[PDB]
Amino acid sequence: DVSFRLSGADPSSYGMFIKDLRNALPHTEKVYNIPLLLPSVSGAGRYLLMHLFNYDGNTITVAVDVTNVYIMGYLALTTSYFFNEPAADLASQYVFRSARRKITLPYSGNYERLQIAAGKPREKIPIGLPALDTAISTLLHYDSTAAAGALLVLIQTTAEAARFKYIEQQIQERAYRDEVPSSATISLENSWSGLSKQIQLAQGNNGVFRTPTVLVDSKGNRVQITNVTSNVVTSNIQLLLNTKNI
Ligand SMILES: *[C@@H]1O[C@H](CO)[C@@H](O)[C@H](O)[C@H]1NC(C)=O
Ligand SMILES: NC(=[NH2+])NCCC[C@H](N)C(=O)O
Numbered sequence: 001d002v003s004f005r006l007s008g009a010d011p012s013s014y015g016m017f018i019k020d021l022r023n024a025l026p027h028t029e030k031v032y033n034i035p036l037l038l039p040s041v042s043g044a045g046r047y048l049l050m051h052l053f054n055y056d057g058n059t060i061t062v063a064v065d066v067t068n069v070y071i072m073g074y075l076a077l078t079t080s081y082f083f084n085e086p087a088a089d090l091a092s093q094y095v096f097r098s099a100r101r102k103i104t105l106p107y108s109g110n111y112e113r114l115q116i117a118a119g120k121p122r123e124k125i126p127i128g129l130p131a132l133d134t135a136i137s138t139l140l141h142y143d144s145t146a147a148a149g150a151l152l153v154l155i156q157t158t159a160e161a162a163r164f165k166y167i168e169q170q171i172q173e174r175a176y177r178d179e180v181p182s183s184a185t186i187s188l189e190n191s192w193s194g195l196s197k198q199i200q201l202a203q204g205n206n207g208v209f210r211t212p213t214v215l216v217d218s219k220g221n222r223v224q225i226t227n228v229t230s231n232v233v234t235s236n237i238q239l240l241l242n243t244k245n246i
Contacts, residue, residue: 002049002051003017006055034199037066037239038067064158068241072088072095073092127180132157163238164238165237
């Protein structure tokens with residue numbers, strides 16, 4: 001398990017949490033020095049538990065699929081909540097079985113559905129450590145519209161930060177003041193599957209991507225990534241989605 005406490009949190013302790021989260025994900029290979037997530041894991045070992053504590057010390061436990069860093073569901077007191085998705089339904093066979101009741105949320109966990117449920121795109125939802133504290137608090141008591149927004153915050157401040165150092169740093173900058181994600185942040189989130197694939201394809205193509213990946217940089221300019229010498233590959237991305245899952 002990994003844990004993060006918002007009480008006394010600062011950029012350093014958040015950084016330690018994200019490092020723990022990355023290190024909890026199993027891999028047998030690295031591809032261009034980036035850990036390659038496993039094609040599959042059977043049984044309960046597929047799921048990592050993240051224990052998150054809000055500023056008041058109340059807690060939720062979030063189940064994460066270790067092959068893709070997707071959040072499947074979470075436990076709040078004696079109630080479990082899962083996305084309306086076959087993969088989350090499967091997760092519910094292994095995690096939080098001692099919950100007194102299980103609620104299936106009225107949406108799947110992908111960005112498009114969550115944004116529809118929340119009533120706003122995540123370009124408009126502030127993120128940061130205060131937003132994460134709020135999100136944990138929201139998830140403690142069921143409200144599906146509010147939860148969709150909280151889950152968008154949760155996904156970006158945990159999973160997305162684990163995947164990209166740039167995103168981790170963006171959250172560190174928002175340790176004491178929320179701010180909507182940069183356009184670069186959104187671009188990276190949207191491109192993880194694509195980048196993971198092209199980095200793996202580059203292995204037998206002399207470090208060259210079979211298909212260029214288009215991204216937005218910190219400045220707001222649109223740029224093409226074509227090979228593994230790009231800063232996004234050498235410095236930023238921290239986990240690769242296995243091509244068998246793409
Ligand atoms: C590879 O990407 C680097 C970094 O962006 C770029 O400067 C260079 O033009 C590219 N080289 C090749 C051979 O694709
Ligand atoms: N990167 C993440 N933690 N994403 C959470 C979403 C998980 C959800 N099961 C999905 O369909 O993606």
